[PDB]
Design a protein around this ligand. Structure first.
Ligand SMILES: Nc1ncnc2c1ncn2[C@@H]1O[C@H](COP(=O)(O)OP(=O)(O)OP(=O)(O)O)[C@@H](O)[C@H]1O
Ligand SMILES: Nc1ncnc2c1ncn2[C@@H]1O[C@H](COP(=O)(O)OP(=O)(O)OP(=O)(O)O)[C@@H](O)[C@H]1O
Ligand SMILES: Nc1ncnc2c1ncn2[C@@H]1O[C@H](COP(=O)(O)OP(=O)(O)O)[C@@H](O)[C@H]1O
Ligand SMILES: [Mg+2]
Ligand SMILES: [Mg+2]
Lengths: 384, 889, 233, 394
């Protein structure tokens, strides 16, 4: 039960013999120590006697109150659910430690004295923003990039899995990572691969839903966001499409662009607060890297800037090989004709043509996908 | 299921061993050549430790086991070659041919004959050959033979050499961490007669390796912290010749054979003092070894370096005696006046600030016993050369007011002002000595015995405290004149002034408050010989303690100096010498557990602890032996303090659990002392658990037990953020916890931790876990606080200056001849290396690096850089010579 | 059960009994909205569009393995488009009615808001009720709808593991929506809804003329010729 | 050799820990109670003593007194108001008007005064705790450090050299420059060195939903600032809390301007904060209102510019001291290669240049590793660089 942290001898050596046999000595002494209590203590039982005595102190109508201050000599001002508030005292089975301003407590029904504290069932927004399971397959699903993969493992994964290199180097990891390029080139996809890979708690928020309809609710949402991200452990915060805070204007926003601006001010703090930040990693992505404020883009707030180019054809054929792997491909087709059909197709375009061609197969109930499926498929996808 | 096809090994080893009784008689070639093909194929096809699924080793013995039992025993004409082909094949799978009762019958194949040169088919293979089989030999077979049949037949004589070539086979194959399996052979082989195997592998260990001396060496001290009595007796004297015969590290001798000093042989460490005085190299390691012999773990040595070559290295002994003691002065003279420490810090009484405004008004606490603690505004903060010129007026104007033991207290504070001094400490006493007062003169001359602590020069062999002693017809002109002499000469083994203090015991004077601390003076001097001391104690114990039924003045004081007269050995002879000495009524048999367990300061012999907790556990005790069970609980406070850390969390998971919460008297009255006898280390697992039962007062009991654990709770040194927990307890201590008996005690508690800033390493664990006597000087106060009647009159002789073996704080020290280098240090957490891959990662707290004399802390291990290599002693010892060397381009 | 009413004595607050089952926050929601529940039998001449929508919605519930026979991922997004009054709402209601899925449209209203949360600072809080009625379909009308759909698809692009949840947006004039929504990997199928011809005006007269008290001999062909294709409304 | 013998004898005592730690009583993991071995002294006494004699004493708020008689006027949270009385245990002195007091439920009389309401979202931005940034780490701007530090701490550490000279030291100071220049990092050294209440304020936190709601947070902030002896108030990104009043037609951004005006009135006009020192920090100072730019509020106007050469070399010595490098490199060449750069960018060159050593297999970076850092961070990331339109502060 969290008895001792020194576990380092690791082998059949004798620090373990003397030390594990030392707590073993004090557990023979502990067992025969407590053995005299059940041997020669018939006065009270104390396993439930004094427990039932506490349960006879506290009444059955256990009211739930709220903390707003603390005075140390076991009395404080607590608020009832009505709003009228008291100056009750605090019991001695209330282990004054989980008492913060705003905490849910248990009061008496009669004199409303502080009986116990209450575990919080938590805000649903944490479960809203928390990614639970692994999204999809690994980095082998990606293909073609092979350089920025080393960059992202370099900035995120290798600091996590090997915290030896940076200490023999005498260095800290690079802080901020941003992603940019043309749309549909794998920016979200690589983040799915990282969410597959890591063991840190992973958070994802769309940049569009940063904006609000009430005044200051944006920056309050940012503050409680980084509260949530900090209060866990070594985590990863992902933000997609942060240009959308600057591009579009919506009529739900009661403030103008001079509320969006203040939201960017509070975020601009929360990347680079004077406070000790902690073990929080930030991964950002957009396709309009030129629109936003470069004060958010400076090194110190974002260190590594990673461009995603359009696929060259050699890489394209690899992507065809990926998205046509487990499908019953008829031999009629030639992928090299399908490569140069569009000069600047994205990685999403290939998967769109493959899936839509499979839909053309399931129109005719067949099992293999033929050439004219691709011939009308590129007409369906590309041209409209 | 892919069976058949390649099944040659379940067919031809199924047929030819089956036709081997049909091919032994009347077929002379098929008996032996198929046995040769049964030996090289089972040999070569099982040498590899990657295919542990051999094709015969789990296959042939469905028929080959009964064929073996009808092959080796049922043949009866076993000749000279067919034993080397038979018992080399039938001996390899036999720990897995048989089931778990193989252990009595490893010999029905092997003892017929050990075939030849058994390692020839055990060269490449690590432990699947027979090393597991030889572990099965030494586990059960050598235990049953060598229980009372050590000097024996083939089961010992060849087994020495089999257990020699297998033991060198551990240091033959790889130099892996299977090397450390060899003490698991050398220990489990002949557990009590460990000498005969350590002779068999000590010279093989001499020819083994020099790089394999460091982890084998810490392997042997890695048992030799503590053990069973005979294992600690034999393995520690076998521990010594490894840095002398094989290795030449040769500088960690005295601090690691202080272990091997007391229980083994008192002349063994004297012969190792001779081994110190043989290796006469030059001056660095020779200096550093004999540095620790004065004021780091022992004394009684300053008559042994007067040989015929007194120039500088045999003239080292005076430098050991007082010049590096003057370097311990030079700590606060040069290297603590620069950092923070002013002439009068004074600001902790200033830190008692805002009780005038914490909810109401103030100027209400006007108790006269508050000035007993306001004397420690002068007393506690003036350690480490905080000398005062007309800033002792809080003891001067209280010195002439009332409180006669306070006239003892303010004059007694001057010794705590001038500590580790010889230069002017006798002169700072005389400016307040002359007052014609039996209190002022005995407190101040009692502080004369405090100033010279660790000097043992001409200060008072018979000079000052003999003149203080010879006045006596009355109070302190009798008492305080022996305690400063036992305190000052507590590190000495001089017999003459011990015999000057022998008629103090043999006086049979009615001054019982003097004759009680007479044992607390003479017990502090010697721990070995002079049974006439124990005779003089027990004769007054019979002449005074037998014809009475009174309080703990006898019990807390008279046998405690006998525990200090017989401290520190596991031999269990002294328990016969003293437990059969006061065979008596049980209130005089209070001393049954004194000398029995005071000899057991650090070990593990838990069979002592079952006779420490099963005789008198509680028994509901209707006011009969609660004090004897509080002393039976008092002797639970050793066995724990230096046996290498690992014990604190379960000590608090014992005594924080079932006496203090679910006991009657032993817990609620007494059982908190363990947390001020084991520790002053500091961890939240009990520092945040004792004010859980202490912040509540529980006034039903004799409430100065819980308030007795208030200041004691605050006993913990290495000052911390505990000003919240103690300042809230004294702020509620303003109204509650009434000031008529504890106004000395609350500010005693507040001033105890951070009286100064430094000087707190008093916790009996030096280097790694060496003793350094944190028991003869720390003991009589924790023994002294059991009942009461000593917070006001009698125990004020003890509550001031009880523990005074304060062997400083720090280890950041250069000690070059010029004193020009600073350091190259890097303080961290306690060590993490026992073995890992290669360069054993030492510890994990890389983020800090200093170069100066700065603070120590307990769980710290300090290394460096710059290619300095620390070539002096390397382990620990806080006075590395720190020379440098540059064969590293 | 959590979120259940009880009876309760008052003097000691001892738990007394277990009343009914209250009401699911979604049943209240659809009761507020009151979509005009529909079926295949009130569809006027949209049969090829029915054959389209069966392939995207009907098939990946009854046969999810059938796409694993082809190694392709199941579609998740449907865009419907055409002029108003052309059966979008009854079609999307009808398909969910016949495949037995919880037809949940979002409007962004604030009477809806109290059944979603106290503030529900995202749109994503709907997904608790969605995966609680997990075989369900999300519906949308005609820029806040357009960002809303992006916030849905960015979740079920792979970040949500619960299946059988699909979205449907219906509008007109497909060029004026977002090009990021027009990224070709995003939308799975787009279906045009034309104005009715002389054939498809006739059967809506047939179906919708059922519940009237007629007179024998009507010649609705002439009337469907007289209406030059306004819409189905 | 004793492979299972240490295993099962290890395991039955590691289990036998729990097998009697159930007999202790640590179990029945709670919903908010405490361990059984703790409060055991409020077991029979305070269970009947902190409960059965001890009241509830509901807390209220005073409206006013009246003359010649106590006859106080109370006010409570929702209910009515009363004519109430003292207890005998209180003096009539500290029952001043506008005060919260503890009041019994039956006679409705006053037992103890209370501290006022603090609105603990203001208490959240009290820092309680200090960072670790040393003035050693803020190298390159030594005279800015000195000219700041003489305003910040010298009256607080020595309030006699200003009194015996006979001057009032200045009370307000703002800090401004391009981003990443060391402004926030410079404030962390002040919060490191000081001792008084360091109450931080980030300006975007004051944007509230209601009308005038942020102004009450300003008022409570300066009230608890006035409660202390000396206090330090930190401001950050005050462009959000106000640029200037510009309003026309449809009144926009008014709610920010009312908060900014309340900040003006709390800074000056009718009894000065006294022993309260403020400290602002912005990116662009051009937008700020001139009445806020008036001295008496913003007396010191410390510039943070780019380091000339030697400040840069000193910054290389700061961010480069604690990493395994080739010994015989020079930094002066690198500071020649960085004309216009921030300490953030210099730090990124250091922390990137270590990663170049981590690329292949080495342990100590080289001069050409530094050269691989310079063209990347400066010249490859030179497309954005964030600096030039902030040099003109637009
Ligand atoms: N290099 C690639 N290899 C394989 N698939 C790819 C590649 N690039 C993109 N894709 C496919 O394109 C789809 C869209 O990917 P993703 O959303 O990550 O691109 P994006 O740039 O993030 O898009 P957006 O710009 O809309 O955010 C993915 O499901 C992925 O399967
Ligand atoms: N003189 C300097 N010495 C060392 N490091 C510096 C210096 N100036 C800036 N830096 C580095 O730049 C980073 C940014 O510091 P800081 O947050 O104070 O920037 P700033 O000037 O406040 O601009 P912003 O408002 O954008 O943060 C810090 O992490 C620090 O490491
Ligand atoms: N093919 C059809 N058959 C029957 N009714 C139709 C048809 N098309 C449209 N309607 C009528 O149009 C109305 C629904 O319009 P719809 O297209 O579903 O939504 P919207 O017009 O908002 O896109 C209903 O009242 C329905 O009766
Ligand atoms: Mg994407
Ligand atoms: Mg800043």
């Amino acid at each position: 039960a969290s008895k001792l942290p020194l576990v380092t001898p690791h082998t059949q050596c004798r620090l373990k013999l003397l030390k594990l046999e030392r707590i073993k000595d004090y557990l023979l002494m502990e067992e025969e120590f407590i053995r005299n209590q059940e041997q020669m203590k018939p006065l009270e039982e104390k396993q439930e006697e004094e427990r039932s005595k506490v349960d006879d102190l506290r009444g059955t109508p256990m009211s739930v109150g709220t903390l707003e201050e603390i005075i140390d000599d076991n009395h404080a001002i607590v608020s009832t659910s009505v709003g009228s508030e008291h100056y009750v005292s605090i019991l001695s089975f209330v282990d004054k430690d989980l008492l913060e301003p705003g905490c849910s407590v248990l009061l008496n029904h009669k004199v409303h004295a502080v009986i116990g504290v209450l575990m919080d069932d938590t805000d649903p927004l944490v479960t809203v923003m928390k990614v639970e399971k692994a999204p999809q397959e690994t980095y082998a699903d990606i293909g073609g990039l092979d350089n920025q993969i080393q960059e992202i493992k370099e900035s995120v994964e290798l600091p996590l899995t090997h915290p030896e290199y940076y200490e023999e180097m005498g260095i800290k990891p690079p802080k901020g990572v941003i992603l940019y390029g043309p749309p549909g080139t794998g920016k979200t996809l690589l983040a799915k691969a990282v969410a597959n890979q890591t063991s840190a708690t992973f958070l994802r928020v769309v940049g569009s839903e940063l904006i609000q309809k009430y005044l200051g609710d944006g920056p309050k949402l940012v503050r409680e966001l980084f509260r949530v991200a900090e209060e866990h452990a070594p985590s990863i915060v992902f933000i997609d499409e942060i240009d959308a805070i600057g591009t579009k204007r919506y009529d739900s926003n009661s403030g103008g662009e001079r509320e969006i601006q203040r939201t960017m001010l509070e975020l601009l703090n929360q990347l680079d607060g004077f406070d000790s930040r902690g073990d929080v990693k930030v991964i950002m992505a957009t396709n309009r890297i030129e629109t936003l404020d470069p004060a958010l883009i400076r090194p110190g707030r974002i260190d590594r800037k990673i461009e995603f180019p359009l696929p060259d054809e050699k890489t394209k054929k690899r992507i065809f090989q990926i998205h046509t792997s487990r499908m019953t491909l008829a031999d009629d087709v030639t992928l090299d004709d399908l490569i140069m059909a569009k000069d600047d197709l994205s990685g999403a375009d290939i998967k769109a043509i493959c899936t839509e061609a499979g839909l053309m197969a399931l129109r005719e109930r067949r099992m293999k996908v033929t050439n004219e499926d691709f011939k009308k498929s590129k007409e369906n996808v590309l041209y409209k | 299921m892919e069976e058949g096809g390649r099944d040659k090994a379940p067919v031809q080893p199924q047929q030819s061993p089956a036709a081997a009784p049909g091919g032994t008689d009347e077929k002379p070639s098929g008996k032996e050549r198929r046995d040769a093909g049964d030996k090289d194929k089972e040999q070569e096809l099982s040498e590899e430790d990657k295919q542990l699924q051999d094709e015969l080793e789990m296959l042939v013995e469905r028929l080959g086991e009964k064929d073996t039992s009808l092959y080796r025993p049922a043949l009866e004409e076993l000749r000279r070659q067919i034993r080397s082909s038979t018992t080399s094949m039938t001996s390899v799978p036999k720990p897995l041919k048989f089931l778990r009762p193989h252990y009595g019958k490893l010999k029905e194949i092997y003892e017929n004959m050990a075939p030849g040169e058994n390692k020839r088919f055990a060269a490449d293979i690590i432990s699947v050959l027979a090393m597991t089989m030889s572990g099965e030999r030494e586990c059960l077979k050598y235990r049953l033979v060598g229980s009372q049949e050590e000097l024996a037949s083939w089961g010992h004589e060849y087994v020495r050499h089999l257990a020699g070539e297998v033991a060198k086979e551990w240091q033959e194959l790889d130099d892996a961490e299977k090397v450390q399996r060899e003490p698991l052979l050398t220990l489990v082989k002949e557990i009590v007669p460990y000498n005969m195997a350590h002779n068999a592998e000590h010279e093989a260990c001499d020819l083994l390796m020099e790089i394999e001396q460091v982890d084998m060496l810490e392997k042997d001290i890695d048992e030799n912290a503590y053990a069973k009595v005979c294992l600690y007796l034999t393995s520690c004297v076998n521990y010594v010749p490894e840095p002398e015969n094989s290795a030449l590290l040769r500088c960690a001798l005295g601090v690691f054979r202080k272990f091997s000093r007391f229980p083994e042989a008192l002349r063994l460490a004297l012969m190792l003092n001779d081994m110190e005085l043989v290796e006469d190299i030059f001056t660095s390691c020779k200096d550093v070894v004999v540095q620790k012999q004065m004021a780091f773990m022992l004394g009684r040595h300053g008559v042994f370096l007067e040989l015929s070559e007194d120039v500088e290295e045999y003239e080292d002994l005076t430098e050991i005696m007082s010049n590096v003691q003057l370097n311990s002065n030079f700590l606060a003279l040069a290297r603590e006046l620069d950092i923070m420490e002013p002439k009068v810090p004074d600001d902790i009484y200033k830190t008692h600030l805002e009780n005038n405004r914490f909810g109401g008004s103030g100027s209400q606490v006007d108790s006269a016993r508050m000035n007993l603690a306001s004397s420690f505004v002068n007393g506690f903060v003036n350690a480490a050369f905080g000398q005062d010129k007309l800033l002792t007026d809080d003891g001067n104007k209280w010195l002439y007011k009332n409180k006669d033991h306070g006239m003892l207290s303010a004059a007694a504070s001057l010794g705590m002002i001038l500590l580790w001094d010889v230069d002017g400490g006798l002169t700072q006493i005389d400016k307040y000595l002359y007052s014609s007062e039996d209190y002022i003169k005995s407190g101040a001359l009692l502080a004369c015995g405090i100033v010279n602590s660790g000097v043992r020069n001409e200060c008072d062999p018979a000079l000052a405290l003999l003149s203080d002693y010879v006045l006596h017809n009355s109070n302190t002109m009798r008492l305080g004149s022996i305690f400063g002499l036992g305190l000052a000469y507590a590190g000495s083994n001089r017999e003459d002034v011990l015999t000057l203090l022998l008629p103090v015991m043999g006086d049979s004077k009615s001054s019982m408050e003097v004759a009680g601390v007479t044992a607390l003076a003479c017990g502090m001097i010697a721990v070995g010989s002079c049974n006439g001391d124990v005779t003089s104690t027990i004769l007054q114990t019979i002449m005074e303690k037998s014809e009475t039924e009174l309080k703990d003045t006898y019990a807390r004081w008279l046998p405690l100096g006998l525990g200090l007269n017989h401290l520190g050995k596991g031999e269990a002879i002294e328990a016969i010498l003293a437990a059969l000495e006061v065979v008596s009524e049980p209130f005089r048999s209070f001393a049954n557990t004194l000398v029995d367990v005071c000899a057991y300061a650090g070990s593990g012999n838990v069979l002592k602890v079952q006779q420490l907790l099963h005789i008198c556990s509680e028994h509901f005790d209707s006011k009969e032996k609660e004090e004897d069970k509080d002393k039976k609980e008092k002797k639970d406070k050793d066995k724990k303090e230096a046996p290498a850390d690992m014990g604190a969390h379960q000590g608090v998971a014992v005594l924080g659990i079932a006496l203090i919460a679910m006991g009657e008297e032993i817990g609620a009255e007494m059982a908190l002392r363990t947390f001020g006898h084991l520790l002053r280390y500091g961890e939240p697992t009990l520092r945040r658990a004792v004010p859980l039962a202490l912040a509540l007062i529980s006034v039903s009991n004799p409430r100065l037990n819980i308030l007795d654990t208030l200041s004691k709770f605050s006993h913990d040194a290495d000052p911390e953020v505990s000003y919240n927990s103690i300042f809230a307890m004294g702020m509620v201590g303003s109204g509650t916890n009434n000031a008529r008996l504890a106004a000395m005690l609350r500010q005693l508690a507040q001033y105890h931790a951070k009286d100064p800033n430094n000087l707190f390493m008093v916790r009996l664990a030096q280097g790694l876990t060496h003793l350094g006597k944190g028991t003869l000087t720390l003991c009589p106060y924790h023994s002294d606080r059991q009942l009461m009647s000593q917070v006001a009159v009698a125990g004020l002789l003890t509550v001031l200056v009880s523990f005074l073996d304060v062997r400083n704080i720090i280890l950041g020290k250069s000690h070059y001849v010029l004193y020009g280098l600073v350091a190259a240090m890097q303080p961290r957490m306690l060590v993490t290396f026992d073995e890992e891959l290669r360069p054993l990662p030492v510890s994990v707290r890389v983020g800090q690096a200093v170069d100066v004399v700065g603070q120590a802390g307990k769980p710290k291990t300090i290394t460096g850089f710059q290619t300095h290599t620390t070539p002096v002693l390397l382990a620990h010892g806080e006075r590395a010579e720190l020379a440098t060397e540059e064969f590293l381009p | 059960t959590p979120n259940c009413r009880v009876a309760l004595r008052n003097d000691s607050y001892t738990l007394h009994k277990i009343l009914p089952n209250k009401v699911d926050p979604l049943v209240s929601l659809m009761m507020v909205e009151k979509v005009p529940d529909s079926t295949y039998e009130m569809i006027g001449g949209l049969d090829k569009q029915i054959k389209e929508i069966k392939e995207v919605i009907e098939l990946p519930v009854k046969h999810p393995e059938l796409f694993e026979a082809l190694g392709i991922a199941q579609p998740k997004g449907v865009l419907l488009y055409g002029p108003p009054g052309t059966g979008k709402t009854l079609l999307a209601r009808a398909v969910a009615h016949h495949t037995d899925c919880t037809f949940i449209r979002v409007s962004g209203s604030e009477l809806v808001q109290k059944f979603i949360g106290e503030g529900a600072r995202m749109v994503r809080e709907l997904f608790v009720m969605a995966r609680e009625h997990a075989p369900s379909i999300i519906f949308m009308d005609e820029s806040e709808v357009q960002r809303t759909m992006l916030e849905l698809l960015n979740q079920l692009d792979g970040f949500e593991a619960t299946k059988n949840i699909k979205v449907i947006m219906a509008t007109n004039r497909i060029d004026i929506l977002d090009s990021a929504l027009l990224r070709p990997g995003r939308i799975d199928r787009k279906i045009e809804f034309p104005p009715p011809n002389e054939e498809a005006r006739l059967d809506i007269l047939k179906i919708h003329s059922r519940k009237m008290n007629l007179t024998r001999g009507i010649n609705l062909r002439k009337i469907a010729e007289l209406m030059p294709g306004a819409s189905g409304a | 050799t004793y492979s299972r013998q240490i295993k099962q004898v290890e395991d039955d005592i590691q289990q036998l820990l729990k097998k009697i730690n159930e007999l202790t009583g640590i179990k029945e993991s709670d919903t908010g109670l405490a361990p059984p071995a703790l409060w055991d002294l409020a077991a029979d006494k305070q269970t009947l003593q902190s409960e059965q004699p001890l009241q509830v004493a509901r807390c209220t708020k005073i409206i006013n007194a009246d003359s010649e008689d106590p006859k106080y006027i109370i006010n409570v949270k929702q209910f009515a108001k009363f004519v109430v009385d003292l207890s005998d245990q209180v003096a009539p002195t500290d029952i001043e008007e506008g005060m919260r007091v503890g009041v019994d439920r039956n006679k409705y009389q006053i037992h103890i005064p209370l501290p006022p309401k603090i609105d603990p979202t203001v208490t959240m931005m009290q820092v309680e705790e200090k960072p670790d940034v040393t003035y050693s780490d803020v190298g390159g701007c030594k005279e800015q450090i000195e000219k700041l530090r003489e305003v910040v701490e010298t009256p607080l550490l020595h309030p006699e050299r200003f009194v015996n000279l006979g001057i009032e030291p200045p009370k307000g100071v703002l800090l401004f420059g391009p981003p990443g220049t060391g402004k926030t990092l410079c404030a962390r050294a002040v919060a490191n060195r000081t001792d008084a209440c360091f109450i931080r304020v980030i300006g975007s936190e004051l944007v509230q939903k209601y009308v005038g709601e942020g102004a009450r947070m300003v008022r409570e902030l300066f009230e608890m600032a006035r409660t202390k002896k000396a206090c330090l108030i930190f401001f950050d990104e005050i462009d959000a809390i106000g640029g200037a009043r510009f309003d026309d037609g449809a009144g926009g951004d008014n709610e920010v301007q009312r908060t900014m005006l309340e900040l003006i009135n709390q800074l000056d006009g009718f009894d000065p904060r006294g022993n309260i020192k403020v400290l602002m920090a912005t990116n662009r100072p051009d937008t700020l209102d001139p009445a806020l730019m008036r001295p008496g509020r913003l007396d010191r106007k410390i510039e943070f510019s780019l380091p000339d050469l030697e400040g840069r070399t000193h910054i290389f010595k700061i961010h480069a001291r604690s990493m395994s490098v080739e010994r015989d490199i020079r930094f002066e060449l690198l500071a020649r290669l960085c004309p216009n750069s921030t300490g953030a960018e210099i730090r990124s060159v250091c922390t990137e240049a270590g990663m170049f050593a981590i690329r292949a297999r080495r342990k100590i970076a080289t001069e050409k590793d530094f050269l691989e850092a310079v063209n990347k961070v400066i010249k490859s990331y030179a497309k954005f660089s964030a600096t030039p339109r902030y040099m003109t502060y637009n």
